[PDB]
Write a protein that binds this ligand. Structure first.
Ligand SMILES: Cc1cc(OCc2c(-c3c(Cl)cncc3Cl)noc2C(C)C)ccc1-c1ccc2c(C(=O)O)cn(C)c2c1
Lengths: 13, 222
């Protein structure tokens, strides 16, 4: 599990 | 000489998304009110960079076609453009409190080897007298660079970048018909932006004496 926060920001609507 | 309706629509999505960008009041008040020391000044730069990466993600998600790209290539594009987009935005805000921000940057424990080309870049950005359309399109062209490390489908990125370069060039012909070198000078800023990636990497390496934020640690592999 890499770039957890970056993925969170990118994936939220 | 005018943009086609399709180019006007593409430009409108970019502008709307660019205009939404904000630096929260909580962070701007810290520039005015926090203590003046190399440690505190470095902490303020860190917080501003974190907010800008958040602003960068929101802008990028609204770029036409970005969300149609392979999910991992979306990550690879954000990681490779973050420093370049942060310098372009810094250049824009500096060329439009400003005295205290400059003082903090010059006294944040960052070497002149980095500060000198930085302030030199802000100067050359200012001499161009860039419009908001130019700042927004250059930011999108920087993000949608098909030659970044770890991109799997480069052709898909090329399809999104080429129409933006077509619009930027058309705007240069419409708004500066007597200056045929205008587009060339903007490209000059694209190549100058790339030099800040090496400078930024050397700053992060030498700063081993520090914590940053989890968002910055992720995008810059700290
Ligand atoms: C003005 C600045 C500096 C900044 O520095 C962040 C850094 C830099 C470095 C350097 Cl000093 C300058 N250019 C880019 C880099 Cl990359 N080098 O190291 C760091 C940290 C990680 C220590 C990060 C962010 C902003 C910034 C961005 C947007 C806005 C903005 C708006 O949009 O309305 C209003 N204000 C006051 C802004 C400030």
């Amino acid at each position: 599990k890499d770039h957890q926060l970056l993925r969170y920001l990118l994936d939220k609507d | 000489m005018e943009l086609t309706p399709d180019q006007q629509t593409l430009l409108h999505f970019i502008m709307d998304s660019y205009n939404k960008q904000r630096m929260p009041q909580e962070i701007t008040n810290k520039i005015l009110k926090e203590a003046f020391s190399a440690e505190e000044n470095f902490l303020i730069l860190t917080e501003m960079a974190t907010n800008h990466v958040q602003v960068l993600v929101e802008f990028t998600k609204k770029l036409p076609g970005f969300q149609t790209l392979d999910h991992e290539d979306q990550i690879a594009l954000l990681k490779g453009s973050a420093v370049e987009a942060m310098f372009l935005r810094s250049a824009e805000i500096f060329n439009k409190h400003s005295d205290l921000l400059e003082a903090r940057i010059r006294n944040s424990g960052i070497s002149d080897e980095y500060i000198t080309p930085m302030f030199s870049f802000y100067k050359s950005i200012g001499e161009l007298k860039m419009t908001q359309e130019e700042y927004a399109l250059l930011t999108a062209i920087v993000i949608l660079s098909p030659d970044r490390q770890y991109i799997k489908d480069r052709e898909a990125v090329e399809k999104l970048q080429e129409p933006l370069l077509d619009v930027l060039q058309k705007l240069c012909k419409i708004h500066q018909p007597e200056n045929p070198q205008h587009f060339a000078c903007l490209l000059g800023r694209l190549t100058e932006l790339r030099t800040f990636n090496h400078h930024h990497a050397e700053m992060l390496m030498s700063w081993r004496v520090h914590k940053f934020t989890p968002l910055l640690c992720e995008i810059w592999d700290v």
